Structure formats: structure tokens, C-alpha cells
Design a protein around this nucleic acid. Structure first.
Lengths: 78, 343, 46, 121
RNA sequence: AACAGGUGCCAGGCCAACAAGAAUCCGAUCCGUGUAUUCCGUAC
RNA sequence: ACACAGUCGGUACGAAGUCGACAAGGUAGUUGAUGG
RNA sequence: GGACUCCUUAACUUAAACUGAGGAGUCAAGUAGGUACAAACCGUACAAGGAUUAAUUAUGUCCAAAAAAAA
RNA sequence: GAGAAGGGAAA
RNA sequence: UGCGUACAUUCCUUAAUAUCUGGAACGAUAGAUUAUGAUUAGGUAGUGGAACAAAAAAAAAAAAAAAA
RNA sequence: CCUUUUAAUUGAUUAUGCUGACUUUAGUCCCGAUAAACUACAGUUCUGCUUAAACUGAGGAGUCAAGUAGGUACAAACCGUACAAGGAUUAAUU
RNA sequence: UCAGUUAGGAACGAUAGUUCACCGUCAGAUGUAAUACGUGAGCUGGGUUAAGAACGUCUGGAGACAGUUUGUUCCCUAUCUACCAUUUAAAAAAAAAAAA
RNA sequence: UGGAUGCGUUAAAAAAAAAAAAAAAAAAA
């Protein structure tokens, strides 16, 4: 069995939107939610990337300085 | 997965999504969205953004069309472009990137000028404005159909939100878009733009081609294609007034910012005052109830849009200035150096 | 066809203007030069 | 070609999909559009005329003088206002239309030579 | 006007070892072998 | 779009005012035509 | 070496948009109207072109749908 | 008042 | 005793090329186009007339009003 | 420009036309046979199949192909690689 | 025979490519017709209508028979209509900035 | 300590019934 005609641009656009919503609500929202929940734990440190990665760390940066009420850096010692 | 999750369909609904229903529902949605706005009840002026380079190009081309001559020509005439011509008839005009550079220059100049204008705190400016960057990446081995998904995800989001989005997807070929976003953010920061208020305003996909390979089958030989595409992203630094009206009044706050606030509170990296400090932006419930409180205060005429905007802008600017001063002090710099850094 | 129509329109747009240059004329440069030579032809020995 | 290419592309402006820019489909669509225009421009006169006729009939029936009697009366009276004018007077000049109806009645409702009073016999 | 080549593109007189104009005026943004006017060389 | 997806037509401002406006009113800027 | 309607016929099961003859009309190569809906029936003061005037053609006059029932 | 035998439904 | 309904070379604008439409007429330095002149102008096959098809070549791109 | 000419072989919605580009089918079909761990105080995961001796006086029982198919950094590069006396009697030097 | 507000139902085999039939059992309720003699992009391939080969028959022959036989690749990932399943919503993606 | 199926068991009643997905004097969202 084969198509009897060419699918139109209008219907292809409709399909684009429908598949976008399907993939969004089926994969992308869930993956983003899991990613944002993982932030409450120290970032994963792969032992196979030791040779080139940074030393292990736990701190997660606050990336909007305009909303930070505390101190940004400590004065140089002497 | 949940196996009972509600997956959305933009064209059909059980409740009835015929065209008349869509019309009525979207009229309701437009009304609600407009009523979500709080507007100042007193302003001195209604300044609107204009692009001098675009206006000059428009007038230049209008003159060329109306007189058949370049502006200032008296003897010769305008010569349109023909096949094989190596001269651009509109070479005197700036390119799109040059116009963007001139826009950034004008924005900087107007920002500096506004700091010495009386009544600058009572002026309405509107949505548009601010600096704009256009960044392009080529040779992406992805097709239009997938790029449309990945760009519809991030359109309209703050840059860090978009980066988090695309990083959460665990897709190998989205590394191209992630590289573009990271490089653009680094470039804007180095040029002095405030990463905190840079949004992805629009995208554009430009095909480049497709490499074809034979695929030998039972009765025929096919050609399988690998795409070649380029992506152009438009980043915009929102002016401080627009940033205030978006985050504070309409409660459209970056989830990256909200997550950082919640992580700080959970880890006790800030004081107890931070809870009330960040109440207007912290969570959905706090944002909703603060919006209700602001609406009631505005309807009783106790809320002051201009005073609130000034307080928000001053707090933001002072936090940034403190960051700069303390990072300088962490180096052991001299008082003269620190003072000269502020000029 | 479309190519011939486009070429004729471009030639009609450029051919009637004096003082053009090679970069302005492109593929029509020899034709434009011959046309201007023919137009000059009447000035010889006045 | 049956129609010039430029005219085809100018006529298919506002159409749906490939009909706007593909010559093969635009030609068929433009042919049909202009043929419809040609036929309907010849046909529309009587479609307007029936509208005038219905308007006049309703206006006359409002005064108890149907269109048939009104038309006979006017034509007999040597009043040659056309249907469009009569409909316009009906919808915009009610007093003048009522005067026309009264004139038509004065001719239609003639009286016999002898009239009989039989109310008390 | 085939009084060839080159010189930023259409040059008899800028170069090209043997003739003759850095000729003048006008050119949106650079240049002009271009327009207009004019002088000169040529048994080329 | 009900549509070989086109064609012919297609909304008639203000009074949204008011210190308004022939014969009666029972004063509503209301009313006059109509007994078997 | 065309089609259908009509008139007159031969063949057929007094059958077939059957086959085959003699004459007119339409189609073929003729739009828009009527006949419910893709040629051949009716009708045309038959279509160069434009327009918001008019006419009793066929045929209609309860509604779909234009068009009579004063006192 | 009729293959009014397109649908409704009329003296 | 009525009326509805298709048809305008009524108005306005074009066209007529196998020797007969006035025209064997009126003009004439190369036809301006007929105002109550006529016939008229659906059309497959076939036949015929006309107008285009932006180019090239040619030894004819300044005796042209007013302004410059 | 106009005029005259042109032998241009001069007008393409159509030949399952030719040479190509780019859409629809569609983000659909297509994913070959068994796999784990590499460790906060020792070790030996499980499975399929069984010529895996490489001097012992013996070139180690073949032919053919790879126009160099198991060299080399998580390389579809660069560089290097078939020695018939096998060169290191290198039990040396340190 | 006529009549419905049409209500519930009518089993299996031998030979046979068979349909319609014949014969046997159960039952004691022949049913008939249409749906492209419904249905092969749903199945089979026994008969039947290719290449091989054989018998009878016809010709001088190659060959043949509305005579009989044996052997002989039954494709398609479903675009649309139809149907059976199936579906949060006003919002819980993005955007929707007025008045002057 | 259990699951599925029929070769097991039960019912063959209701149709204004069992049940459902859009409360509706809201006539220009």
C-alpha cells in the first residue's frame, strides 16, 4: 500500500506541532524535571574523567549576582 | 513512565476544541493575559525605541526608488544589480551586523544619557529596546524537523534556562546548539552584557545541503542523506524597566533563577531575611499570592509602580556593584585603583 | 522562458545608461561596450 | 498560454499553497477563477433584480398592495420607475413609496357604475 | 569605426627604447580608458 | 472551510445628546387606526 | 467509415444507447436558462467587450425559491 | 391537486 | 382581472484582407478612428489575415520649442 | 531608440521526455548470535567452543588471497613493518 | 393461504476439487435469495487456462483437442474513506506591554 | 503463598435499564 497523493504543507505543519507536543510532554518535560531535581546533590564525578576533569566539588553556583544579598568574595589576607 | 500522564494535543480536546470554542477560549486567555498587567498611573513621557540605521536605509531606498538616483546624484542614475555584477548598488549602506553594532552603540549612549536626565524615573518605554546580538553556527548534522523541536523548546527563554533545557535532553547532536549557546553567553558577558537579562528572542534555520551515500538493496540502490544546516539565534538584553515589569509584575521568572534561590535557602547559604527578600519570585504559590497582594495594593492606590521599579533597579545595581568591588578587593588592590575603576 | 525574460529585463534596465563600468555590467559588458561604440560612431569626423 | 504568466501569478495572489507560486497549478486555478468571474458577471443582473422584486413586494404588502397589482397600476398610470428605483424608495423614502402605492391603488381599485347598499334589506 | 597589447574598465597623443594632450569642464560614495568641448600626430 | 479551495456581493458614523420637542395629555419628550 | 430525439421502415423475442436504411432537429464543433444531478429534449432578438435598465421564451405562481387575492 | 416520482407538507 | 422569468451592436469601447459594404467616396508630406450608414463578430478539423517575440548587424543617436 | 534585415532553425503546464535540484511517504521501515566487574585492607564473574608450544641434530607438514587485512596516542591520520649466516658468544657493559 | 410493535433458534460425517446433489448418524426445526454467483492489498490452492512429459485421437509434418493425465515462485512496511480501540484543561510549553 | 484459562461455575433479569463526555434564561467570548 502506498499514498494516493502528496501530503500538503499545511498538514505537515500540523504534524510538526502535534509531534512537538507529543515529544515535549513525553520526554523533554520529564528529563528537565529530573535534571533540575538532581541539583540538590553534588554533581556527578566520573572516575574515568579524572585525568582531565576538575577536582571533585559539591558547591553549585548562584548564577544571578543581581539577586545575591550576601558576600561575593573575601578580602585578601595578609 | 507514569503510563497515565496527560499528553497534550494542540488541535483536539475531549472538552471540545472546535474553531468556535478556540475563538472563545483564546479571547478569554487574551483578556486574562492583558489584565495580568499592572501599569503606572502617572508618567512624565512615553519614550519609544527607534532604529536610526534602519530608518536611514529605508529613506535611502525610498529616495532611490522615487528619483531613480542616489541621494545627491545630479547627472548619472541608479544602476540595479544584474547577472555577474560585482558591485553592490547599496554598498554605501551598513550590513545587518553593522546595524546591530550601531544599535548597541546607541543603546549604550542612551543609557549613559539617561543617568543625567531629570524625571527619568517616571518615563514609560515599552516592550522593545536594548542591545541585540545575532550568532550563527554552521555544519550541524541535523534536519529541519528536529531543529524545529529543539528551537521551539528554547524560544523566548532566558539564556541559562535554555542551556539547562538543552543539557537535560542527553542528545548527542544537541551539543552543537549547546556549544553555540555557551559561546554566545561567553561573548556577551565579555562584551559587557548582563547575562541575567539576556533572552533568546528568535531563531532562523538555513539549509546548507545534504551528503548522500549509496544503500544497496535487493532490487534497487537507494541514497541515504545526512543533513547540513545552520542556526542563527537572536539574543536580546532586556532593559532594566522591561526586566522589572517581566519578573516583578508579571511573575515570568527564569526557572534557573528560582532553582538557585531555592538551593541557596535549602543550603542555608543566605540569611533568614532572604525568604521575604525573594518571596516575590521564589515559588508558584508565593508568586501568585504576591501578585494578588500587588493587585489589591494597586486597586487601593497604595502601590507605586515607579517607586517599586526604582527600588528593584537600585537593589539589582547595588548587588552587581558590590560583586565588582569585592572581587577587586579580593586581589589586594589599592584604594586608588578601586576608586579609578568606578570612573 | 524565465531566464530569457529576466536577462532581457536586466539588459533593458542597464543598456540605456551612459558611463557604466564592467563591475556594474557583469555578463552584459561586451554588449554594452559594442552598443556605446555604435552610439559614438556618429561623432567621428563630426 | 491561455493567459499570460505574469497575469496568472498576479491573479493567484491570496490563494492556498502551491497555487500561489507553481505555474502548473496556478494556471489551472487562475483559469477557473476568471471563468467563474466571466460567467457570474453575466449572471448577477437577474440575481440583483429578484432582490429588488422581493423588496418591492414586501413594501407593497405592508400597505396591502402586492407587487403584481402595484406594477400593473404604475405601468397603466404611465409611471416607468424601474425596479431598483422602486426598491430604493421602499427602503429609504417610505413616504414617497406610500404615495406611489396610493396612486397605484387609485387606478387599480376602480368602482362599478352602480353600487348597492344591502345593509338593511 | 581594428589608429592592435598593457595600465583598476572602453586610450592614436600614460607605458610599450623612433609621432603626437599630466588638454579643459561634469561626475552620489574611491578611480576613469566615461559625457561634452577642443588641440595635436599619422606614407603607422 | 459545507467548497478543484475559487467567484459575485458583503456591515451605512453621530441622539452614546438633552439647560430636550397639528391636536390631546392627566406630564410618560406618553398618545390619535380598530365592534361582530 | 458518427451519436441521440422525431417520422416511415427491414431484422430482433413487434427486446436492447442492438443491427441496418430514407429524411428533419440538436450534439459533434454551441456558453449562460428549464427539464432534480456529465452531449443528443424544450427554448434563445445564440456568447466581440463592459455596466446594479427593459422585454411574457420554455415554464411557473403554499415553503426550500422570484412571482394576485382591498373594502 | 399534477412522474407532486428531489425534500417538506398544503385545498 | 395579474405578475415572475433567458435574450441590448437602447448606452459606451473595439474588430472585419481567398478581389462586391457605401469606398471607382472623402483626404493625402506617408489616413484621426464614419456622431441614428449597412452586414455583422459561438466554433473542433482545415484554410487565411494581422500584432508581438525586450536581441544582434548596419558606416544616419543633435538643423527641434523654453531652460541650462 | 526608430528603420531594414537575420539560416535564430527564435516562444513549452504535458512526450511513463533528457540532465539535475528539491519535497511527500516520515522522523516511518531498517539496529546480526550472551554478557559482568575493575573494588574504604588478600583472591578465582559467567558463558560458547576446544591443536593454545613458539629449539631440543628435523625452518617447526602445504597452496592461494590481502598489488602489504591484527604495528602505533580511545586515529577511517603521520611514521614504521616479510633479513634463509636470524647477527645480543649480551654468562657482555653497569 | 392471510397477518406483526419481526421475539428466540435449526448438529455432524464416508466417497468426492467440487456447488447443487447421493449415502450414513443425531435431531424430528426442507428455509430461500441478494450483497461484483459478499469477502484471495484477510487465508488456502484441490479443479481450472503457459514453459516439461505421457496415453487416446487428427495430419505428411511441425503440431493440435471447449479429450484424459503428472509436475509447476499466490507480491505489497496502509496515505485517504470506513470501522474497532483511544483522548486533562481556562492554565499548569513559549508569547500575548495598556492608557496618551 | 498464588496467577491465568476452560475441559470448570454462575446468570440470561432490567431498556424511562445498566451508563455516560459538554447545568443550558449565556441572543454577538
Amino acid at each position: 500500500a502506498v499514498p494516493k497523493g502528496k501530503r500538503s504543507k499545511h498538514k505537515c505543519k500540523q504534524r510538526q506541532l502535534i509531534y512537538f507536543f507529543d515529544q515535549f510532554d513525553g520526554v523533554f518535560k520529564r528529563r528537565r524535571e529530573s535534571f533540575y531535581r538532581s541539583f540538590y546533590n553534588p554533581p556527578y564525578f566520573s572516575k574515568q574523567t579524572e585525568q582531565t576533569s576538575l577536582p571533585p566539588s559539591v558547591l553549585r553556583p548562584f548564577r544571578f549576582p543581581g539577586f545575591w544579598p550576601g558576600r561575593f568574595a573575601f578580602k585578601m589576607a595578609s | 513512565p507514569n503510563t497515565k500522564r496527560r499528553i497534550r494535543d494542540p488541535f483536539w480536546r475531549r472538552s471540545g476544541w472546535w474553531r468556535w470554542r478556540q475563538q472563545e477560549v483564546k479571547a478569554m486567555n487574551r483578556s486574562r493575559a492583558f489584565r495580568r498587567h499592572l501599569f503606572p498611573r502617572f508618567t512624565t513621557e512615553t519614550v519609544s525605541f527607534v532604529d536610526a540605521a534602519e530608518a536611514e536605509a529605508k529613506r535611502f531606498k525610498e529616495i532611490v526608488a522615487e528619483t531613480g538616483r542616489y541621494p545627491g546624484q545630479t547627472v548619472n542614475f541608479f544602476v540595479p544589480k544584474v547577472e555577474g555584477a560585482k558591485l553592490d548598488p547599496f554598498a554605501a549602506l551598513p550590513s545587518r551586523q553593522k546595524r546591530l553594532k550601531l544599535r548597541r552603540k546607541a543603546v549604550r549612549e542612551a543609557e549613559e544619557a539617561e543617568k543625567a536626565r531629570e524625571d527619568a524615573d517616571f518615563v514609560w518605554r515599552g516592550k522593545g529596546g536594548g542591545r541585540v546580538w545575532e550568532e550563527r553556527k554552521a555544519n550541524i548534522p541535523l534536519g529541519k524537523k528536529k531543529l524545529l523541536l529543539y528551537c521551539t523548546i528554547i524560544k523566548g527563554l532566558q539564556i541559562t534556562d535554555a542551556i539547562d533545557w538543552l543539557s537535560s535532553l542527553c542528545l548527542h547532536r544537541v551539543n552543537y546548539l549547546l556549544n553555540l549557546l555557551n559561546a554566545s553567553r561567553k561573548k556577551i558577558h565579555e562584551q559587557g552584557g548582563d547575562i541575567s537579562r539576556v533572552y533568546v528572542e528568535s531563531y532562523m534555520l538555513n539549509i546548507q545541503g545534504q551528503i548522500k551515500r549509496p544503500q544497496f538493496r535487493l532490487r534497487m540502490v537507494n541514497l541515504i542523506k545526512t543533513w547540513k544546516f545552520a542556526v542563527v539565534l537572536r539574543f536580546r538584553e532586556y532593559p532594566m524597566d522591561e526586566y522589572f515589569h517581566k519578573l516583578f509584575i508579571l511573575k515570568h521568572v527564569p526557572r534557573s533563577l528560582t532553582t538557585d534561590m531555592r538551593l541557596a535557602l535549602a543550603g542555608q547559604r543566605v540569611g533568614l531575611h532572604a525568604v521575604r527578600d525573594w518571596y516575590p519570585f521564589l515559588d508558584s504559590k508565593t508568586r501568585f499570592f504576591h501578585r494578588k497582594r500587588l493587585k489589591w495594593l494597586d486597586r487601593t492606590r497604595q502601590f507605586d509602580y515607579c517607586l517599586a521599579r526604582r527600588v528593584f533597579k537600585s537593589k539589582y545595581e547595588e548587588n552587581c556593584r558590590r560583586r565588582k568591588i569585592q572581587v577587586l578587593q579580593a586581589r589586594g588592590a589599592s584604594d586608588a585603583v578601586i576608586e579609578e575603576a568606578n570612573l | 522562458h524565465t531566464e530569457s525574460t529576466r536577462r532581457k529585463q536586466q539588459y533593458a534596465s542597464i543598456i540605456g545608461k551612459q558611463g557604466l563600468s564592467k563591475k556594474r555590467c557583469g555578463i552584459h559588458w561586451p554588449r554594452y561596450r559594442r552598443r556605446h561604440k555604435a552610439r559614438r560612431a556618429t561623432k567621428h569626423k563630426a | 498560454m491561455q493567459i499570460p504568466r505574469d497575469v496568472i501569478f498576479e491573479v493567484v495572489r491570496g490563494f492556498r499553497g502551491r497555487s500561489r507560486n507553481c505555474i502548473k497549478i496556478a494556471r489551472v486555478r487562475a483559469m477557473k477563477a476568471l471563468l467563474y468571474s466571466s460567467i457570474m458577471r453575466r449572471q448577477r443582473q437577474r440575481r440583483y433584480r429578484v432582490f429588488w422584486i422581493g423588496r418591492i413586494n414586501a413594501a407593497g404588502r405592508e400597505w396591502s398592495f402586492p407587487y403584481a397589482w402595484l406594477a400593473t397600476s404604475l405601468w397603466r398610470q404611465n409611471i416607468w420607475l424601474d425596479r431598483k428605483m422602486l426598491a430604493n424608495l421602499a427602503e429609504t423614502e417610505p413616504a414617497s413609496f406610500r404615495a406611489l402605492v396610493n396612486e397605484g391603488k387609485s387606478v387599480y381599485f376602480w368602482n362599478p357604475d352602480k353600487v348597492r347598499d344591502i345593509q338593511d334589506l
